[PDB]
Design a protein around this ligand. Sequence first.
Ligand code: CLA
Ligand code: CLA
Ligand code: CLA
Ligand code: CLA
Ligand SMILES: CC1=C[C@H](O)CC(C)(C)[C@H]1/C=C/C(C)=C/C=C/C(C)=C/C=C/C=C(C)/C=C/C=C(C)/C=C/C1=C(C)C[C@H](O)CC1(C)C
Ligand SMILES: CC1=C[C@H](O)CC(C)(C)[C@H]1/C=C/C(C)=C/C=C/C(C)=C/C=C/C=C(C)/C=C/C=C(C)/C=C/C1=C(C)C[C@H](O)CC1(C)C
Ligand SMILES: CC1=C[C@H](O)CC(C)(C)[C@H]1/C=C/C(C)=C/C=C/C(C)=C/C=C/C=C(C)/C=C/C=C(C)/C=C/C1=C(C)C[C@H](O)CC1(C)C
Ligand SMILES: CC1=C(/C=C/C(C)=C/C=C/C(C)=C/C=C/C=C(C)/C=C/C=C(C)/C=C/C2=C(C)CCCC2(C)C)C(C)(C)CCC1
Lengths: 91, 194, 194, 217, 165
Amino acid sequence: LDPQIVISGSTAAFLAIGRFVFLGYQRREANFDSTVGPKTTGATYFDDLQKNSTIFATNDPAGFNIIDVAGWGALGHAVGFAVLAINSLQG
Amino acid sequence: KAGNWLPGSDAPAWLPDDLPGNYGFDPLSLGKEPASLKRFTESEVIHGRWAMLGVAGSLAVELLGYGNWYDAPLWAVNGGKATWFGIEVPFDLNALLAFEFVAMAAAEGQRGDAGGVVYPGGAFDPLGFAKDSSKSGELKLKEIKNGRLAMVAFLGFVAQHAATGKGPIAALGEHLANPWGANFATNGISVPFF
Amino acid sequence: KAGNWLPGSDAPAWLPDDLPGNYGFDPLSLGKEPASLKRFTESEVIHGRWAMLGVAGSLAVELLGYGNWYDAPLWAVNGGKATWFGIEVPFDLNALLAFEFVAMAAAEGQRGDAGGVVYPGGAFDPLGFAKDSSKSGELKLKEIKNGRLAMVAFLGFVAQHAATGKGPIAALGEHLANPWGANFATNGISVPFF
Amino acid sequence: RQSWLPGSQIPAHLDTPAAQALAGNFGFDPLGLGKDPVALRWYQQAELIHCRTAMAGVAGILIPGLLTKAGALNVPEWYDAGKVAIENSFAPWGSLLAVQLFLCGFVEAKRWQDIRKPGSQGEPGSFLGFEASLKGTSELGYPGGPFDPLGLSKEADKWADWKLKEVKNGRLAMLAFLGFVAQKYATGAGPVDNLAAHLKDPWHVNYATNGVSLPFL
Amino acid sequence: DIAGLTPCSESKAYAKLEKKELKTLEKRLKQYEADSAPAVALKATMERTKARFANYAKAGLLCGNDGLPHLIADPGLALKYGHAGEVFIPTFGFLYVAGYIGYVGRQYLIAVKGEAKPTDKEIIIDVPLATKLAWQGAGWPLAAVQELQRGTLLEKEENITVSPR
Ligand code: CLA
Ligand code: CLA
Ligand code: CLA
Ligand code: CLA
Ligand SMILES: CC1=C[C@H](O)CC(C)(C)[C@H]1/C=C/C(C)=C/C=C/C(C)=C/C=C/C=C(C)/C=C/C=C(C)/C=C/C1=C(C)C[C@H](O)CC1(C)C
Ligand SMILES: CC1=C[C@H](O)CC(C)(C)[C@H]1/C=C/C(C)=C/C=C/C(C)=C/C=C/C=C(C)/C=C/C=C(C)/C=C/C1=C(C)C[C@H](O)CC1(C)C
Ligand SMILES: CC1=C[C@H](O)CC(C)(C)[C@H]1/C=C/C(C)=C/C=C/C(C)=C/C=C/C=C(C)/C=C/C=C(C)/C=C/C1=C(C)C[C@H](O)CC1(C)C
Ligand SMILES: CC1=C(/C=C/C(C)=C/C=C/C(C)=C/C=C/C=C(C)/C=C/C=C(C)/C=C/C2=C(C)CCCC2(C)C)C(C)(C)CCC1
């Protein structure tokens, strides 16, 4: 009934399942240039709080930024605490 | 052209002839468009394989005497332990849920990346059938026909146990006992105004 | 032309002359088309062989005194054990059902693959008759005639036991006892208004 | 030609070579239903099926109904034949109705597809070999082959007369069955007994006296 | 029973209302004579009233807590418990006669559009033609499904649609 085993195994499983098999299918939806590449053709402030500013660099061979880690880890935590919570009501 | 589902009537134009299980069965004109038809072929074959597996499984469970398919998952809501052919299975509901999620997600993602492929080869052909692509068409026909039969049988399982609450082999046994005395007219829930 | 089933009337045009048991008997015009006629020839000969076997079997059973053909399968519904010529048979209903299903499925599939073949040869000819194909036609004629007779006799068995409930030789014996006193007019269920 | 009402204008849709070639034409169409030749075709099919099943049913009512007044054939009344039969039988009426729904739906589906397409049911490989003799006989509603076993439908000189006898007896049979229903709800006994009680006293026992069939007098 | 009520035969409120109506009616009856047409009409009213109560009790009607009949509008429920004569049969009767009226009218309209002055035969009814078509449609539903299945029931898109879109 260890919380560390449930949560750690959960986040490990979801980071793995996002690492190896659902990477390319998530990267096929990066191509929105068919419909939107200029989200905002702007010059100044009030347009670049809305346009991209920084690019998170990855020396990762596949290219996980901190954002994908945050996402898959977040799903892992949600599911892990769901498992512990369903375990919580006296089995 | 394996046949014609309604003698005399003309076949639909959008069904191509070289295709397994091409009986021309389409009243609703669901597959008139190409890409949708291809997706539907994929879905039909896959549902067929899963239906075969499920029906064979329930029949094996009841035929070797381990309860029905309905009380196989009984050990998880009411406290207990899973089994296999007379041996206990040391796992928890969440354990099998985790390994099922990971394994099925991996397998189905891998499959769902190679476009739409229905017949693989090489390492999903480990015994050496369907090599000449000649009788392979007939094997496709046999595959899809047995698959349709299995889907219908499984829908039968769901409805039958939803009506009478007994297992398949038990229902067949009692139906062979008294044929006119008990079938879906003695059901009492199938046809209401009896 | 083995004969003519109705003197004077013309033979049907679709029956070919070189054919066993060609009496020209077809009021309904059932075999006017070629492929259907071939299928019917197959069916007639096969039904004839099976009828011969069944009739000979029921006769042998009653003639050697082991009950009728109706109470040969009596040991399975009411608890008991099968027999043959005075010796017990150590099997269960499901055991004979399994071996019958497998054996008959194998044999009939094998037969049903070689197109439509009615006269095999070589290993279904182990004694050396019908080699010249000359008197083989006459043997075909004798085969088909005895087969028609056997079919009629077996339908007689079913109707007779459905009427009076007695076995064949018992019915013949009592009919030879009092000819006018007991036949299908003393049946009481054949002709209703008596 | 004969007409139902001598002197009445026969409608123009019942006066064609296609409509005068029909069995039992008497120009009877007061409500002009058959203005569509396709609809007239379908309605002719309806009349034929109703004729045949009406004859069968009414014969089933009468002949046991008559012969039970003799010694043999103790048959109960037609409005009570079901109950006694099901008490005689082996299965409940629900399963029997289901089985007859299946076995009749198959056949009626056949016949229907032959109505929509005339040469339909005979096409190679469809059935196991009766496709040989499941075509029509060039006049829809009158198949041949395994129907008409005795060969009575081969001669061309008796053709229109066999047709016309069929349609006349059938119309009379439909009238007879409607009479069976009304006499059941009106007097409350079997039709044979109604016939006997009317022959016994004609001028006193009819539908002018039963007190239901016209209540205003 | 059917949604928590009772049939009117054993309904206590039913007989109380019946007694109340008879009571007021006899109260009106008391002050006249025994041969007077007032008393004749009053006794006629008594007879019709009691006959009405008996007829409503005989038909197997269902009464709530007010003792008044309640109709059940549900095919499965009414056909299962013997109430087809309160909504079901009435709706098929009405649909028959209403479609009959509509079909007769429509046939008249098409019959008179083909003349030289459609407005005169609309304002001044062609009585022979109107009686003729008034008979000719007693079986309308068959002609209706035929006109439907032949595609003559519906005009195509030569109808005038609003301009612009
Ligand atoms: C798993 C579902 C499924 C799917 C997706 C398909 C797909 C296909 N079938 Mg198919 N088939 C199936 C099951 C399926 N089959 C089963 C079970 C049978 C046996 C009855 C058949 C028998 C069959 C024949 C005989 C033929 C096809 C054909 C086809 C193809 C063209 C028809 C089409 O557009 O299908 C699209 C289908 C769907 C979109 C199905 C979706 C499910 C619908 C929307 C709801 C069904 C609800 C159901 C009736 C509820 C029952 C409940 C119960 C209590 C009554 C297409 C590839 C034709 C062909 O050439 O074969 C390849 C053809 O002639 N099928
Ligand atoms: C097992 C059934 C069977 C079949 C399929 C055939 C097939 C054939 N026979 Mg045949 N025959 C049979 C049994 C059969 N025979 C029997 C038992 C007899 C003895 C009475 C004969 C005597 C016979 C003669 C004398 C002739 C044929 C001929 C033929 C050929 C052409 C006729 C045709 O189209 O047949 C098609 C047949 C069928 C489709 C039969 C199907 C069964 C029907 C549809 C239902 C029968 C129900 C039955 C009457 C019910 C009785 C119940 C009882 C209580 C009254 C064809 C190869 C002709 C020929 O050239 O010989 C080769 C010919 O001249 N037959
Ligand atoms: C289980 C395995 C098996 C298999 C795969 C086959 C396969 C075959 N058999 Mg076969 N057969 C088997 C077992 C088997 N048989 C057994 C156990 C018997 C009894 C000993 C027979 C007796 C038999 C005969 C007599 C004939 C065949 C024929 C055939 C061929 C026709 C295929 C077809 O479409 O028929 C599809 C058939 C059906 C779906 C069933 C038809 C049911 C009939 C019409 C009903 C008959 C009346 C019924 C029995 C009620 C009678 C009541 C009684 C009291 C009188 C096919 C090669 C026929 C053949 O070779 O013709 C080319 C043929 O004439 N077989
Ligand atoms: C206007 C919509 C409507 C609504 C809300 C209802 C409501 C009801 N109907 Mg119903 N019915 C309707 C229209 C409607 N009917 C029409 C138009 C018909 C003629 C085709 C029927 C024919 C009918 C029958 C034959 C039966 C009912 C029954 C019922 C009851 C339970 C079933 C149910 O709700 O299914 C949900 C209904 C809908 C979503 C509306 C569509 C109408 C369908 C065709 C009716 C469904 C019947 C259902 C499958 C039977 C279930 C059996 C039950 C024992 C579980 C419920 C009071 C059952 C009953 O008597 O209950 C005790 C029953 O046996 N109805
Ligand atoms: C074709 C067409 C066409 C036209 O156009 C239209 C129409 C007609 C509409 C259409 C039709 C359709 C249809 C009918 C369909 C059907 C389907 C199905 C039934 C499926 C199933 C399907 C089914 C399936 C898959 C199934 C599967 C199953 C399984 C896995 C099982 C499992 C299991 C096991 C291990 C055992 C245990 O103990 C439990 C469980 C868990 C239970
Ligand atoms: C020809 C024609 C033509 C024209 O055109 C039309 C018409 C006339 C319709 C037609 C006719 C037809 C007919 C008549 C037919 C018949 C058939 C039959 C009878 C069969 C049987 C058939 C029959 C058969 C096979 C049989 C078989 C039998 C068997 C195996 C037996 C078995 C057994 C044994 C071991 C013994 C034990 O103890 C039991 C049992 C189990 C019992
Ligand atoms: C012509 C026309 C034209 C113009 O345009 C207009 C108008 C005038 C309107 C029209 C008219 C019409 C009419 C009149 C019709 C009628 C119909 C009918 C009557 C039918 C029946 C019909 C009828 C029918 C089918 C019947 C059937 C019967 C049956 C099955 C029976 C059965 C049975 C029997 C055996 C005995 C048992 O135990 C029981 C039962 C079950 C009872
Ligand atoms: C270095 C490296 C490595 C490793 C890596 C890792 C292992 C990472 C990790 C990472 C991680 C480990 C991450 C994590 C993250 C997490 C997160 C992001 C979380 C979130 C959370 C949440 C979201 C929660 C929420 C909530 C709450 C608060 C309560 C309950 C309810 C809810 C659900 C709302 C290896 C050896 C493989 C190799 C390569 C290199």
